Design a protein around this nucleic acid. Structure first.
Lengths: 118, 156, 30, 165, 106, 196
RNA sequence: GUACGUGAAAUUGCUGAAAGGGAAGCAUUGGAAAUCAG
RNA sequence: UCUAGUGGGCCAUUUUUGGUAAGCAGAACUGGCGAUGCGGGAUGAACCGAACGUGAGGUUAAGGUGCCGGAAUGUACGCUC
RNA sequence: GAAGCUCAGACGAGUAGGCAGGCGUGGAGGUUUGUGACGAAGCCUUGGGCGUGAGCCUGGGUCGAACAGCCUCUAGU
RNA sequence: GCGAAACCACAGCCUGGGGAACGGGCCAGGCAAAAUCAGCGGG
RNA sequence: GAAACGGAAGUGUUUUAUUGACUUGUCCAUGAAAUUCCAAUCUUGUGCGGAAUCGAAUCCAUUGCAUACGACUUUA
């Protein structure tokens, strides 16, 4: 079953590009006269529940695997029964020695590692 | 420094910090004398000091008088800031001396990099100045490949 | 144009022509 | 764990219904491939394709499978086919060899096969047998050997939706 | 050398659009030689082709190709609708396209 | 219906806007168009009516620094180009590029007088305007509002027609000779069953 | 390196790239160049 | 049973007495608008259609099919210089 | 994970306002044999991924000592 | 050579139209080629 | 290898003799293939080892017919 994303571009906040104080994160326009709130033609779009993706393919990487954050050897050892569903994600703050230890363990379990090249 | 050069292979460096000169004039002189030969830059600075040539003003060109000596650079506006040139002349003396210390060939030196940055305002606007001198120097698919094969046999 | 005036009636005229036509019809009704 | 067994799909297979004018023994233009624009005589009616050849002594188009969507069935006079057997041409007869891996390349792979080495002598025996059984028919009616030797091409002011091929 | 051109010359006119809206999903193709919808039924389903040239050379071949299919006649004057795998760029209005005689049905 | 690289249109007897509308469509269609013999273009309405239509155009000029104001081109080629330009989205890059594919010249210059000149029946005066309807030629209408090259173009046209007629007489002499030899061959009527 | 831990933004300069005929910014669709990803 | 927010105005129709060069005023009613984006009318607070999750395809409304602009420089009968 | 699984149908503008579920921040109790000088937090990034969204995970660079997930409490959030 | 401040949503060609206030952004046109120097201050 | 003509923007036209081809007008023989169902012209380029080629403008200065400064008119 192919993974499908309804939308790829993120919803940028209104005027988040003309100002450095207004941030990229989405905020809902509150103004009564906002041409964006009234959803005029040509204006940027607003997040709606209609863009929700399929429940069967939601939270899945482009290869159909869900990410699970792993911080020590114990975590990946818990992933042995879902090598077909969950791919391990080494946490950023895991030391070099533990990373090679986890990645060798994950290889033994045959569980996918997304950032094994570190 | 600012740029990937200044490798000790064929470079020499100099810099000045908190030099009591206007930032905009120093920028215009730096832009002009960039890329010239070292000895060529010296006489040019001597010319500017003696009004026999002028440094074009390009970005900070507000209110500059038009002179005929700005014709070589293609601009209409020129000025002769002598304070900033004296600062640049001293800096080039030091950069030339550093070239002597490293052991380059001084006849073929060029101004490879020069940059003027604003300094902590103290009012006047001091300028950090830095100079670098240096030296100059698919596939074949089954069908596409088969046609290549047949045409190879065709020529023979 | 080619004329001594503008053929495009400005929206004021598009506004008050119809109502003054309506007042005319009301006058005949009275 | 899951290995979701596919539901028993209710799709069957039925013989492909070729066009009315794509009968064996006709003359058709070839629209694609390395021999686009050539004219070739259809020998036999395959499952999906047409086992078609130009008489190799005439134009040099060996016996090939061609999908019927890249064929224009000309109304040229029919060439008899009862004189030649056509059962020996099957899908497996035309099929490729295996590959033994997903990737193979290099000019050594090109100096091999070629129309000498991986080309069996039995194919020429079949090819010459076909030519022996069709040249008398093509020779009988005029311009036919010359018609098949030529190539089809459009011209300025030639509109295919009005041209009755 | 006139023993070639197994295609039919055509032109890209615009996208399918209203006056203030465009849908680049489908493109309006003027198949040269076709002057009504009953004639455009012939080319309905053929393989249309946009051929262009680039700067980088992939395959050692300077020509890139964007494939497409004639989908529906569009109007009275013999224009058709085409669906290209990649929507044609807007710089290609008036650019010439090719109409292959296949999938053949004649 | 079929495109060439370049089309050279002889614009004698064609209506101004009727021809300019077709040309506007062909330019955006992506084809180079050369319009020749512009000084015989026709416009509906009697001459004095159209003379007023153009003398009102002379009235439009910016009151501040009229060098900024509208430029009222007088040459017949330039009047035709004005018609086409107003029928194009020239305020864009695709409209701008359509003008660059349009050539409008008065008379037929030597670069083009040796090529076939087609006409546009959707714009021909004899097929559009009812007989007895007054009309004015652009070439006359330009020679009365400033264009000062009417006579020279007419002078050069007369010479060109003489050369073109001499060519045609030579081509007819050759063509009648081959036609005699064309019919002389016997194979003609052993292919006559094919309609040729 | 005492104008001393980390050193953000506004802001300035240099290099590289790109665009620009009385603005720009933004959105949709693709092309081109760069760069990834399975 | 308890408990938020609102208690304006504008536009047009229908009635409607006083009325005058002429508008104007008076009520009652109706809808629409405030909270409403979209298609069309060159553009527009009210005109014509249409009441909105994300998309694909098909078909239409209003309005249009010379060109700008997607769509007949269509067919037929007249009027108009 | 009965707070779960499953099938079916209809519906989807929205101001004041009414209701529900979530994202994020400082500190507290509990838990994860939790992460860390073989580099914590922070910071940069034309690197990658996830969510409709609030936001979240990660690669590379800089950095040098502390920090986080979960269930609850709390507020100068 | 020394060297400010007021001010600053963003900007700066023109005609007509946009219910109003018709405007600098909208619509329809006229058009439109860098960088500047000095006067007049029209706006 | 040459003649003639073409000035509206001459984008060429023609006469040619020449050479070397090519040589379906017509009829024959060789070869194509496992690319075994679709996916010539255009110029830089960079150099090749052989030929020949040997200009101007401005600043500096000057003039005053010109001039706020540029610019302009001279001289050099």
């Amino acid at each position: 079953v192919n993974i499908i994303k309804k939308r790829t571009k993120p919803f940028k906040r209104h005027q988040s590009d003309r100002f450095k104080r207004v941030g990229e994160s989405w905020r809902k326009p509150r103004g009564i006269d906002s041409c964006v709130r009234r959803r005029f033609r040509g204006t940027i779009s607003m997040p709606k529940i209609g863009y929700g993706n399929n429940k069967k393919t939601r939270y899945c990487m482009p290869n159909g695997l869900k990410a699970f954050l792993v911080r020590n050897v114990s975590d990946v050892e818990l992933l042995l029964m879902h090598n077909k569903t969950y791919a391990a994600e080494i946490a950023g703050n895991v030391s070099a020695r533990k990373r090679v230890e986890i990645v060798e363990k994950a290889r033994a379990l045959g569980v996918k590692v997304t950032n094994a090249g570190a | 420094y600012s740029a990937s050069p200044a490798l000790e292979t064929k470079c020499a460096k100099a810099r000045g910090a908190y030099l009591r000169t206007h930032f905009k004039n120093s920028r215009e002189v730096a832009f002009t004398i960039n890329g010239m030969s070292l000895k060529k830059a010296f006489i040019f600075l001597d010319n500017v000091k003696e009004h026999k040539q002028a440094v074009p003003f390009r970005r900070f060109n507000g209110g500059v008088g038009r002179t005929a000596q700005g014709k070589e650079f293609g601009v209409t506006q020129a000025r002769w800031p002598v304070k900033s040139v004296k600062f640049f002349y001293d800096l080039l003396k030091n950069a030339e001396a550093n070239a002597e210390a490293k052991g380059l060939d001084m006849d073929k030196l060029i101004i490879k990099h020069v940059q003027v940055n604003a300094a902590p305002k103290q009012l006047s606007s001091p300028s950090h100045i830095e100079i670098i001198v240096a030296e100059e120097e698919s596939r074949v698919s089954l069908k596409q490949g088969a046609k290549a094969r047949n045409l190879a046999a065709r020529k023979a | 144009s080619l004329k001594k005036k503008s053929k495009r009636r400005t929206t004021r005229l598009r506004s008050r022509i119809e109502k003054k036509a309506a007042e005319s019809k009301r006058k005949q009704k009275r | 764990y899951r290995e979701n067994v596919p539901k028993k799909a209710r799709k069957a297979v039925r013989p492909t219904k070729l066009r009315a004018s794509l009968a064996p023994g006709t003359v058709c233009i070839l629209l694609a491939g390395r021999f686009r624009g050539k004219r070739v005589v259809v020998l036999s009616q395959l499952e999906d394709t047409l086992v078609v050849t130009g008489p190799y002594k005439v134009n040099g188009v060996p016996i090939r499978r061609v999908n019927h969507r890249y064929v224009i069935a000309t109304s040229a006079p029919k060439i008899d086919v009862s004189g030649v057997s056509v059962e020996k041409f099957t899908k497996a007869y035309f099929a490729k060899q295996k590959r033994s891996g997903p990737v193979k390349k290099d000019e050594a792979f090109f100096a091999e096969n070629a129309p000498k080495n991986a080309l069996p002598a039995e194919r020429i025996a079949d090819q010459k047998a076909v030519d022996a059984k069709l040249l008398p028919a093509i020779k009988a009616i005029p311009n036919m050997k010359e018609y098949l030797a030529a190539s089809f091409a459009l011209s300025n002011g030639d509109r295919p939706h009005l041209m009755k091929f | 050398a006139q023993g070639h051109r197994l295609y039919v010359k055509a032109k890209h006119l615009s996208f399918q659009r209203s006056k203030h809206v465009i849908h680049p999903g489908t493109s309006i193709v003027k198949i040269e030689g076709c002057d009504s919808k009953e004639e455009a039924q012939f080319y309905l389903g053929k393989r249309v082709c946009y051929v262009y040239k680039s700067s980088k050379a992939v395959r050692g071949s300077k020509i890139r190709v964007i494939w497409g299919t004639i989908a529906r006649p569009h109007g009275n004057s013999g224009a058709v609708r085409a669906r290209f795998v990649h929507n044609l760029p807007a710089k290609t209005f008036g650019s010439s396209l090719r109409v292959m005689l296949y999938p053949s049905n004649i | 219906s079929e495109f060439q690289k370049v089309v050279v249109i002889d614009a004698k007897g064609h209506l101004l806007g009727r021809l300019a509308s077709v040309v506007a469509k062909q330019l955006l269609g992506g084809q180079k168009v050369v319009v020749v013999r512009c000084e015989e273009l026709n416009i509906s309405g009697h001459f004095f009516r159209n003379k007023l239509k153009y003398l009102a155009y002379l009235r439009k000029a910016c009151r501040y620094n009229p060098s900024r104001g509208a430029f009222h081109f007088r040459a017949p080629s330039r009047i035709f180009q004005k018609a086409v330009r107003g029928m194009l989205p020239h305020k864009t890059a695709r409209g701008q590029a359509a003008l660059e594919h349009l050539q409008a010249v008065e008379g037929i210059p030597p670069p083009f007088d040796k090529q076939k000149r087609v006409v546009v029946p959707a714009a021909l005066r004899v097929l559009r305007l009812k007989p007895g309807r007054k009309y004015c030629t652009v070439g006359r209408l330009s020679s009365e509002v400033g264009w000062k090259y009417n006579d020279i173009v007419a002078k050069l046209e007369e010479r060109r027609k003489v050369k073109s007629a001499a060519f045609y007489q030579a081509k007819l002499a050759k063509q009648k000779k081959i036609a005699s030899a064309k019919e002389a061959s016997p194979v003609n009527q052993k292919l006559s069953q094919f309609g040729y």
